[PDB]
């Protein structure tokens, strides 16, 4: 199917800082515990009810978790072990077979006084985030990392945006000062498999408290169909590849949280936190930050919204311009009079060739150069109503590709077989700091690949003759001008 996907879904292992016990909902008898249960809760049982193991108060709270409308709301429930007195945050969620109970020990009265302190810091931070004049995504991510770091204490926190490749880039970071900085570093789209990404869409915050710690096995009675869904569990164990990936990166413990937007929801980026030591932050702080991530996502959705607004606003003006040019008398006026085809679309140059004569503007090829590009175009591309590329080299055109570092991106529109419209752009500098590896599109997640990369040193890639890419908006502008000009030239043809 999809690589890794339920090797993680029903992994059958959890982390060492608490333990997960799944239970039938009307039996209240255990379908599954973990072999670290009976000691750290303070002792054992199997196929047993759970109200047995601590205060009848705690049973009041769990039965009232079970008949809640909306299980999700009562978390974090709080329990106290009869055999020990030990306090644990209980965190529940309903799955197929039943309900899952994650139990995280609380810290050792003295630090709940600071736990609430950082929860009020969390509201203050969400309101600070909403009190922000839009139109500045850099400022957004900066304030997000600063307040997540001051909330959680992690040594490194950053925002990691996904590119259309689903390869990612550290786009803002604040760190303990001694650590090497990962700002600017792009990483390969395969470091996070599409399985793990689409799975972040449902579960939105993951902590791992120590990678060098030995995971604990599940107990499942053998009657049950298979290892159950452990996606929802706070203390899920991590896949081995990502564990050694951490170890190699120098990140002992990490907190990493989705950043989501809703059109049917997609994953914009992550917020990722690194501790060089082991860190376990209590579930309240986790929940609060998840709200802060929600606010992140929504102020981003506002930035997107106004992107789209202003885009359609400039679409409107290129249509004022389309009319304006339908009014010029002769094709040459496309280039002749005030608003020319070099203003249709962001250009370095542009040109029209119509009937054996050359009408160019901006940075352009020669007459001989142009006719060679057209000889190539018709020789190979006779079936596509034009084309667009950001490197005539990479495209496959030999010749002026060599003779052009001032002309490297090209878009062209077939009017008829005889004559064409052209827009050109020069090379312009992209340097990319790759963090150990370049992203290879042809690579895609391999399920039984068991080992990760070894290094992460920066290295400059330099793309050496690329134009900025033609976006669909500029392509739409061109294509529609193409259509109206075919219409118009045969209107004139048949009038005369
Ligand atoms: C194994 C051969 C391949 C592999 C698998 C893999 N990766 C993940 C999950 C994550 N990978 C990252 C990557 C990063 N963490 C960082 O700090 C950075 C740089 C800023 C990167 C690029 C992340 C964030 C995750 C999410 C996991 C988490 O919650 O922290 C998984 C899923 C892990 C799981 O058990 O759920 C897997 C299977 N990664 C590789 O590199 C190999 C190609």
Curated annotation (Swiss-Prot):
Modification(s) after translation: Contains one covalently linked phytochromobilin chromophore.
Keywords recorded for this protein, A-Z: Chromophore, Photoreceptor protein, Phytochrome signaling pathway, Receptor, Repeat, Sensory transduction, Transcription, Transcription regulation
UniProt-listed GO biological process terms: detection of visible light; protein-phycocyanobilin linkage; red, far-red light phototransduction; regulation of DNA-templated transcription
Protein residues bound to phytochromobilin: 241
Keyword Oxidoreductase: no
GO MF term set: phosphorelay sensor kinase activity; photoreceptor activity; protein homodimerization activity
Occurrences of domain GAF (ranges): 155-327
GO cellular component assignments: nucleus
Disulfide bonds: none
Family stated for the protein in its record: Belongs to the phytochrome family.
Function: Regulatory photoreceptor which exists in two forms that are reversibly interconvertible by light: the Pr form that absorbs maximally in the red region of the spectrum and the Pfr form that absorbs maximally in the far-red region. Photoconversion of Pr to Pfr induces an array of morphogenic responses, whereas reconversion of Pfr to Pr cancels the induction of those responses. Pfr controls the expression of a number of nuclear genes including those encoding the small subunit of ribulose-bisphosphate carboxylase, chlorophyll A/B binding protein, protochlorophyllide reductase, rRNA, etc.
Quaternary state and interactors: Heterodimer between subunit A and subunit B.
Name of the protein in question: Phytochrome B-2
Source species of the chain: Glycine max (Soybean)
Classification lineage: Eukaryota, Viridiplantae, Streptophyta, Embryophyta, Tracheophyta
Covered range of the whole protein: 95 to 616 of 1149
